Structure 1
Amino acid sequence: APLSFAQQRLWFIAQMSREASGAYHVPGGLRLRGELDEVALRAALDRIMARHEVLRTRFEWHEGEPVQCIDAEARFPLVRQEAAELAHWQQVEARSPFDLGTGPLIRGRLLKQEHVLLLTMHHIVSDGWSMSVLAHELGTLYRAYAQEGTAPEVDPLPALPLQYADYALWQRRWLDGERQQRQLAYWQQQLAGAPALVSLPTDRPRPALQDYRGDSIELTFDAGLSQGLRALSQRHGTTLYMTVLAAWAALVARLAGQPEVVIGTPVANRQRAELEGLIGFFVNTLALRVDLGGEPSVAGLLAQVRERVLAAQSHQDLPFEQVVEALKPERSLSHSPVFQLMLSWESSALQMSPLRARPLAPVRERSAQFDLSLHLHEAADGTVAGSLTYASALYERETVQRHAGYLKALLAGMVADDTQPVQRIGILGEAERHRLLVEWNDTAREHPRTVCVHELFEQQVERSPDAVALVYEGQQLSYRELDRQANRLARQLKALGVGPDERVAVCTERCLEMVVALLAVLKAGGAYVPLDPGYPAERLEYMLADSAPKVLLRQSGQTLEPGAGVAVLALDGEASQPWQAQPAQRLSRDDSGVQPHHLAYVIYTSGSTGRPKGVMVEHAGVVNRLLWMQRAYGLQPQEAVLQKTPFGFDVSVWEFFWPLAVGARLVMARPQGQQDPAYLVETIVGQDIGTLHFVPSMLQAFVDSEGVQRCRGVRRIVCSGEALPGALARRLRQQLPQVELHNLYGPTEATVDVTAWACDAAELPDNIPIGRPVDNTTMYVLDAHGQPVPTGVAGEIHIGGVQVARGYLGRPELTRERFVPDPYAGRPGARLYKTGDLGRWLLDGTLEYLGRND
């Protein structure tokens, strides 16, 4: 049961109101493990109450603007009430709403020698630094009150040199002057043109409204890495924070595929020594734009980050909100402005001045104001530890864990060699590298590697010679009748010099004799070259001359004349009768001499921008492609497949030879029949079609056609050639609830298809994946240097395995460029095909097509 659009909208808005409850509070606590002297503690809390003027301040509405009201004689409120209770009592105290009109804006919690001294302040009167000052004065005041009786333990001995209202009066005048205008001018130029949104790969699409649900992981830099990072930063004059910022920016730019990254950082903004002991709202945010173009070195990047961090810290008085208003007066509501990743660097003055006061550790962060929030601090033992909070709507936990692993690996590389290119440092762990290269390519399947394409058909003829094999416009041929017709023509082709790796061009519209021709060429040991008569004459004549075939099989009525010594054989009509005198028995395997490594066909590319390339495809890869398809989908002998794809596209290869290898019948659609919506529906129903192919644009026309809901006998619809929108997949489910939808992907240079994804999930994604590699086929997503990229990162798709084509006919240079040695398979001579397509691995080990690399 789904919510309406207005219900879902109001829910996300109502939970953003839940974000405005605890995200504006500054919680904290201390553990008391000593004598119970609550008489001195209450005097210590009330002493810091009356001393720090901001703690006894309320806020009202007075004539169209908020005003502050400083009250006198403020009493500290404290409530008096193992693992489950302390955790529940903590965050509910941290999520306790305060009243800004009445106060108090600072509360506490305590109960029963060991006690729990919880404390919470509102962000309008405090910040991160304010809790450290609150804990500083509490330990000193409880100590002085535990020594002997006092009345002003902190009022005359260390008084406040400046109150928060004095700071606000100074800031009100500073914001009106020119110093504020110069700092705004710097930030205007420093961040002009920066990317508005980091393109970090997300496990789920970014919601329309920013989801603030968060979770966090812990990460640690051991003493070895921390020591090396300290020495690295001393050598380059950077701080330990600058070195981590340089590494994280280098990692994010590499993961996102963007030249520069913006990372925010909160600063204390207490540069003047007059404010360092004050309690109040002082924290400001700085946006750090780190550029990684030009492939810098580790040393060069550290010098850039050192430069821009010092420049940012010189202009840190300007409020970050005024930077956002100047840069992005119009801003998206699905992500934070200017930056979406924050890096906070915490420190380690004093600690526990009273007695046995332990700093209570904060609860695990569950609110995500940004996409990623990296918190780090230098522990006492020199090790660097912290947390990485992530937005649950965007990332899964394992993705964030691998993200932290890349950062630690990149930091170790920067220590190992600060002179190397920073963006080529290895970051993948061995576990993920093995999963990407091996585990997700575990497709080895035992198929007979000694059988050719036509022999699969011949083996089926012996199993069911009288079953129906081919249907065309009221005519039909059994398996035996089709085999005999192909044998006669194959012997005629053999008499004309057809043999291993020789080409035979075939120019015909769809009919029974089209399949006779294709099988006869294969039986004669040659490779067929489909010449679609619908193509322009210039294109047909080029492919006819480029392929240099021994024979042209031509349908009667076609006028294509090769000349050049090419033998022309009539495919049908009265002129084809002479080769009916050939014996109908099969040619022996030695008579043709064809082997699985010989060519099965040469199919030319589109030639959209130049001359088409003849893709040379061998028998063994086609056999693997066909045997996988039967293992995946289980086509049965009583089923029918529709031959509707023009046979110049290699999708027709499985339309032709998959049913004929397994006992099903192939229904040859009328020429250009797929373009008639009425004919397609009537043929599907009339001929009991169970399986057919659509490019997504034509599947859209199919589901929009009249009477599409009559096709409830359809079993499988295979999609390939374009991106398949999830909306179209859902639309097909509504029209035909029984049909199985499968999304396939693969170029001609890798034998028809190499990945497949069944669209059988209860809820389908907006972008249908291309899936997992097929049998004996491998897939790789590599960067510009041939290295595997992290999971989710976009790179160029590479294809390995037995289906990689032999190359381009007559174009050895281009073949060497796109068919490169395979460095993974462990097989000598194996090759990868560079697709020129962009893609990425998903979490579940499925591939996603992202477009062309250029």
Structure 2
Amino acid sequence: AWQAQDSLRAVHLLATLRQRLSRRVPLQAFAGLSLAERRLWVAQQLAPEDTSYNLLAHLRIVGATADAIEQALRQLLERHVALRRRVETGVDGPQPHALAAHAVPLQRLLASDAVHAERLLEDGVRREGARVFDLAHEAPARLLLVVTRDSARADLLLSVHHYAFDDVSLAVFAAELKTLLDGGRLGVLASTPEQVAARERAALASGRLDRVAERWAERLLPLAQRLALPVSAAVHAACRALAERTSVSPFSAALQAFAEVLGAELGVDDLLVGVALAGRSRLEMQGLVGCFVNLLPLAVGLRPEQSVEWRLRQVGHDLLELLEHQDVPLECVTQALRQRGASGLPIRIACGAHAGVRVEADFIPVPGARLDLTLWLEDLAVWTGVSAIFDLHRIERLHQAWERRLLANA
């Protein structure tokens, strides 16, 4: 398990050991629709013409025929029900209904050369970016397959609504596509998006997740344009060294400097920071396709009187607590806060981190921002902010302050 594998890899290590030898180990001492699907679906209902929930994935495939690619995609659509479901509104919750795999639109186009293949792709990007999905009557996914004449390269544009997809789903979809195009076989899936929702309803009914949310509501109660810049090697090394001395993850050190820079910028002593989590809490959710992402709050205290090491231990500790209980939906934390006299929790800032046929898959970023400012680290610092608050030049200034804060803390 060790040789097969960050702190998310630590969760995967503890899950493999739990499946083989039983008994937990709690990470902190070593390091119908689900609510994840529903919160994206209801946000689309409140703004039906908003297309900021359209996910566009570009898959570059080298070494497979058009017939083999199309056939492999029909297999993946049959295998992953989340890409071929319609959603009826319900009296006590939206209700999904499975559709046939052939009902997913698939358009094959032949391009004369590579430049023509780019232009077909760009035209598809603009068309799918402005498209309003009919989530009640059609599948939430479309596919554009562009093959280039006299070339081994084929391009696949996957447009799928966010309620039925996420980042890990793209990696699973791309790897399984490569497996089929190579001639391999896919094992029987151990779960479905519907089973995840059913298990969540049981966990909600047992009060287990709400008790964890009530514990978090204590600390959280007082608080109740895209730019991609490369991180210098000196800042990356200092981030790693600071984490090794503090026994936290390198992401915890980068989150701490992120919250401290923004806290000084906004002039506050405490800053609420969201942490985007993959939300696949059990081993059989690792190979699923759908939406499992869960944004959970993290209260960072900006105490200049305290040491850098102590502030970092608190950040990394609170981070592993959110990682352990990433199955606790954000709505549970909101419910616990309202039960203590709060209108809600106001999250404005967030953070996160990401032989044979060749399959390269990447998302085309979604324009517009729900949150005021986000920082995503790619193993590259991707800053996304609302233009009216965090413009391009203000983001560049914050990234420089973030890099300085990291070097100073180390």
Does TM, scored on the shorter chain, surpass 0.5? Answer: yes
Deviations 1:170-192 (A, max 9, x none): 11111111202211211211311
Q: Indicate whether 1:187 and 2:182 are aligned.
A: no
- Please name the residue that 1:366 is paired with: 367
- Please name the residue that 1:340 is paired with: 348
Q: Quote how far apart the aligned CAs of 1:41 are.
A: 1.2
Q: Indicate whether 1:262 and 2:290 are aligned.
A: no
- Counterpart of 1:94 (choices 100, 125, 129) is 129
Amino acid of the residue matched to residue 159 of structure 1?
A: V
CA distance in structure 2 between the partners assigned to 1:316 and 1:117 by the alignment: 32
User: Structure 1 stretches of 5 or more lacking a match?
Assistant: 1-15, 146-152, 197-214, 347-352, 379-384, 416-854
Deviations 1:38-58 (A, max 9, x none): 111121111111122333322
What do you get for the CA RMSD once the two structures are aligned?
2.6
Deviations 1:543-572 (A, max 9, x none): xxxxxxxxxxxxxxxxxxxxxxxxxxxxxx
**Retained in 2: the 8 A contact 1:287–1:339?**
yes
Q: What pairs with 1:698-709 in structure 2 (closer than 5 Å)?
A: none
**Retained in 2: the 8 A contact 1:46–1:75?**
no
- Please name the residue that 1:242 is paired with: 252
**Retained in 2: the 8 A contact 1:49–1:75?**
no
- Please name the residue that 1:651 is paired with: none
Q: How many percent identity over aligned positions?
A: 28
Q: Quote how far apart the aligned CAs of 1:75 are.
A: 4.8
Q: Quote how far apart the aligned CAs of 1:235 are.
A: 1.7
Q: Indicate whether 1:128 and 2:167 are aligned.
A: yes
**Retained in 2: the 8 A contact 1:244–1:411?**
yes
- Please name the residue that 2:14 is paired with: none
Q: What pairs with 1:438-457 in structure 2 (closer than 5 Å)?
A: none
CA distance in structure 2 between the partners assigned to 1:24 and 1:361 by the alignment: 13
Q: Quote how far apart the aligned CAs of 1:282 are.
A: 0.9
Q: What pairs with 1:541-620 in structure 2 (closer than 5 Å)?
A: none
CA distance in structure 1 between the partners assigned to 2:166 and 2:371 by the alignment: 19
CA distance 1:400–1:162, shift in 2 (3 Å): same
- Please name the residue that 2:35 is paired with: none
Max Rg structure: 1
- Please name the residue that 1:407 is paired with: 402
Partner secondary structure for residue 364 of structure 2 = coil
- Please name the residue that 1:283 is paired with: 293
CA distance 1:181–1:65, shift in 2 (3 Å): closer
Q: Quote how far apart the aligned CAs of 1:315 are.
A: 2.7
CA distance in structure 2 between the partners assigned to 1:54 and 1:133 by the alignment: 13
Amino acid of the residue matched to residue 59 of structure 1?
A: V
**Retained in 2: the 8 A contact 1:324–1:338?**
no
Q: What pairs with 1:735-750 in structure 2 (closer than 5 Å)?
A: none
Deviations 1:58-105 (A, max 9, x none): 222466653222235545422234566644432432342222222222
CA distance in structure 1 between the partners assigned to 2:54 and 2:331 by the alignment: 19
Q: Quote how far apart the aligned CAs of 1:270 are.
A: 0.9
CA distance 1:76–1:228, shift in 2 (3 Å): same
- Please name the residue that 1:43 is paired with: 71
Deviations 1:607-634 (A, max 9, x none): xxxxxxxxxxxxxxxxxxxxxxxxxxxx
CA distance 1:371–1:319, shift in 2 (3 Å): same
Deviations 1:425-467 (A, max 9, x none): xxxxxxxxxxxxxxxxxxxxxxxxxxxxxxxxxxxxxxxxxxx
Q: What pairs with 1:109-188 in structure 2 (closer than 5 Å)?
A: 109-111=144-146, 112=148, 113=151, 114-144=153-183, 153-154=185-186, 158-188=187-217
- Counterpart of 1:327 (choices 295, 319, 337) is 337
TM-score, length-scaled by structure 1: 0.39
CA distance in structure 1 between the partners assigned to 2:46 and 2:81 by the alignment: 30
- Counterpart of 2:81 (choices 32, 37, 53) is 53
Higher relative contact order, structure no. (Cα contacts within 8 Å, ≥ 6 residues apart):
2
Q: Indicate whether 1:316 and 2:326 are aligned.
A: yes
**Retained in 2: the 8 A contact 1:26–1:128?**
no
- Counterpart of 1:396 (choices 391, 400, 406) is 391
Amino acid of the residue matched to residue 218 of structure 1?
A: A
CA distance in structure 2 between the partners assigned to 1:266 and 1:388 by the alignment: 14
CA distance 1:71–1:399, shift in 2 (3 Å): closer
Deviations 1:458-507 (A, max 9, x none): xxxxxxxxxxxxxxxxxxxxxxxxxxxxxxxxxxxxxxxxxxxxxxxxxx
- Please name the residue that 1:29 is paired with: 58
Amino acid of the residue matched to residue 170 of structure 2?
A: M
CA distance in structure 2 between the partners assigned to 1:267 and 1:62 by the alignment: 28
Deviations 1:139-173 (A, max 9, x none): 1111117xxxxxxx42xxx1101111111111111
**Retained in 2: the 8 A contact 1:264–1:287?**
yes
CA distance 1:293–1:20, shift in 2 (3 Å): farther
CA distance 1:182–1:20, shift in 2 (3 Å): farther
- Counterpart of 2:358 (choices 350, 356, 359) is 356
Amino acid of the residue matched to residue 52 of structure 1?
A: H
Amino acid of the residue matched to residue 116 of structure 1?
A: D
Which of the pair is proportionally richer in helix? 2
- Please name the residue that 2:8 is paired with: none
Q: Quote how far apart the aligned CAs of 1:268 are.
A: 0.8
CA distance 1:79–1:258, shift in 2 (3 Å): same
- Counterpart of 1:80 (choices 108, 132, 135) is 108
- Counterpart of 1:306 (choices 316, 325, 337) is 316
Q: Quote how far apart the aligned CAs of 1:341 are.
A: 0.8
TM-score, length-scaled by structure 2: 0.79
CA distance in structure 1 between the partners assigned to 2:174 and 2:356 by the alignment: 10
**Retained in 1: the 8 A contact 2:278–2:292?**
yes
- Please name the residue that 2:142 is paired with: 107
**Retained in 1: the 8 A contact 2:274–2:295?**
yes
- Please name the residue that 1:796 is paired with: none
**Retained in 2: the 8 A contact 1:30–1:358?**
yes
CA distance in structure 2 between the partners assigned to 1:264 and 1:405 by the alignment: 21
CA distance 1:285–1:61, shift in 2 (3 Å): closer
Deviations 1:690-712 (A, max 9, x none): xxxxxxxxxxxxxxxxxxxxxxx
User: Structure 2 stretches of 5 or more lacking a match?
Assistant: 1-44, 110-114
CA distance 1:138–1:46, shift in 2 (3 Å): same
**Retained in 1: the 8 A contact 2:105–2:143?**
yes
CA distance in structure 1 between the partners assigned to 2:306 and 2:83 by the alignment: 49
Q: Quote how far apart the aligned CAs of 1:28 are.
A: 0.8
CA distance in structure 2 between the partners assigned to 1:85 and 1:51 by the alignment: 28
Partner secondary structure for residue 179 of structure 2 = helix
Partner secondary structure for residue 161 of structure 1 = coil
CA distance in structure 1 between the partners assigned to 2:49 and 2:57 by the alignment: 19
**Retained in 2: the 8 A contact 1:42–1:76?**
no
Q: Quote how far apart the aligned CAs of 1:249 are.
A: 1.1
CA distance in structure 2 between the partners assigned to 1:397 and 1:100 by the alignment: 34
- Counterpart of 1:66 (choices 94, 107, 129) is 94
**Retained in 1: the 8 A contact 2:141–2:160?**
yes
